[PDB]
Amino acid sequence: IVAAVSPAGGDFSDPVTTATLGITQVFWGLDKKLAQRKHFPSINTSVSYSKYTNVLNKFYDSNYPEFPVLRDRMKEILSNAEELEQVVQLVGKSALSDSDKITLDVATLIKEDFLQQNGYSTYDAFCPIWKTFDMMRAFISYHDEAQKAVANGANWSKLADSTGDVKHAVSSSKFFEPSRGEKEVHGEFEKLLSTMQERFAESTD
Amino acid sequence: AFIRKEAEEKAKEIQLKADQEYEIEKTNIVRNETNNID
């Protein structure tokens, strides 16, 4: 059952929103913030939730994908980056640390290269399960590699200096191709971790 | 001479860190796989 509710001004106080949210085991919300900017499909990470997500994780484990882990990690990164946004908007961008900045940069990367997919495009219009899973996995790998590199005593900016290649590569995973060539993507991720190792070698020195 | 010595030292440190990473990853993967099986 898929039913569209059109509350006045998008307010949850409308009878429609409440009555809908009451009997629903899952709800996908639509935001007018990124829709007004002609940005891709807009969904609130602080609003949209599903109660069927658990059995969905159990079902996604059939493909031996990690739905729950990647989703919780990305949601935590999103919440921490949102709080980081509140703090940066409060004081400034010079009042934060390297890890928080990495969280904000990762938030931007997840915003531009993941949640936003052009429906009019010949690629981003439809995203396969394996494509999104590999994208989230490679994103998590780059995030873990960056977090580990930051723990080695390297600055986030200095780490972001030689990582432009991996960044452009992570942003280029939206186009890709048909079912054939998934190996090229996973391999590109391996080349990304290897690139991280090369950067580590470069740092010393 | 200094370039050669620094390169040799960097490669040596890379090798030591490589072996250390091998043993550490051995213990870690052992614990992780054991946790998965359990």
Curated annotation (Swiss-Prot), chain A:
Phosphoserine PTM positions read 62
State the name under which the record lists this protein: V-type proton ATPase catalytic subunit A, 2nd part
Q: Which organism is it from?
A: Saccharomyces cerevisiae (strain ATCC 204508 / S288c)
Please tell me where this chain falls within the complete protein, as first and last residue plus total length: 867 to 1071 of 1071
From Swiss-Prot, chain B:
Q: What residue ranges carry the coiled-coil annotation?
A: 1-24
Subcellular location, record wording: Vacuole membrane
Domain of life, per lineage = Eukaryota
**Region named Interaction with VMA10:** 1-17
Q: How does it assemble?
A: Homodimer. V-ATPase is a heteromultimeric enzyme composed of a peripheral catalytic V1 complex (components A to H) attached to an integral membrane V0 proton pore complex (components: a, c, c', c'', d, e, f and VOA1). Interacts with VMA5; the interaction is direct. Interacts with VMA10; the interaction is direct. Interacts with RAV1 and RAV2 components of the RAVE complex, which are essential for the stability and assembly of V-ATPase.
Please describe what this protein does.
Answer: Subunit of the V1 complex of vacuolar(H+)-ATPase (V-ATPase), a multisubunit enzyme composed of a peripheral complex (V1) that hydrolyzes ATP and a membrane integral complex (V0) that translocates protons. V-ATPase is responsible for acidifying and maintaining the pH of intracellular compartments.
Q: State the similarity comment.
A: Belongs to the V-ATPase E subunit family.
Q: Other comments?
A: Present with 16134 molecules/cell in log phase SD medium.
The name this protein carries in UniProt is: V-type proton ATPase subunit E
Organism from which the protein derives: Saccharomyces cerevisiae (strain ATCC 204508 / S288c) (Baker's yeast)
> Which part of the entire protein is covered?
22 to 59 of 233
